[PDB]
């Protein structure tokens, strides 16, 4: 508890990775025509945050 911080026709994309105690987040957002599968094409995700937290992540879960 030693760290704390504050700041279907749409597709949100994200990347999460943890390296040498820093946790990094990237994203991209767009409208879309077809909602059941990922749209065939290309655009690149860009950074959001980089957290100095030091934790040993092996699992994750979504919140609805």
């Amino acid at each position: 508890c030693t760290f704390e911080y504050v700041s279907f026709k749409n597709l949100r994309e994200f990347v999460f990775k943890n390296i040498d105690g820093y946790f990094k987040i990237y994203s991209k957002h767009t409208p879309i025509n077809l909602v059941r599968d990922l749209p065939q094409g290309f655009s690149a995700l860009e950074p959001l945050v980089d957290l100095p937290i030091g934790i040993n992540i092996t699992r994750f879960q979504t919140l609805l």
Binding site: G21, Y22, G54, N56
Partner: protein, 42 residues
């Protein structure tokens, strides 16, 4: 007694016993079963 020792930039405060022996120590201290923290005699 407050000052104690047990990847890069890791931190870990977990209290689970060192199972130094072949014994599954299951929270009980004894020969080769020890609490993970030791204190500097400052």
């Amino acid at each position: 007694y407050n000052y104690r020792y047990r990847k890069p930039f890791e931190r870990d405060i977990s209290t689970e016993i060192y199972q130094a022996g072949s014994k599954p120590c299951n929270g009980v201290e004894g020969f080769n079963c020890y609490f993970p923290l030791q204190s500097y005699g400052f």
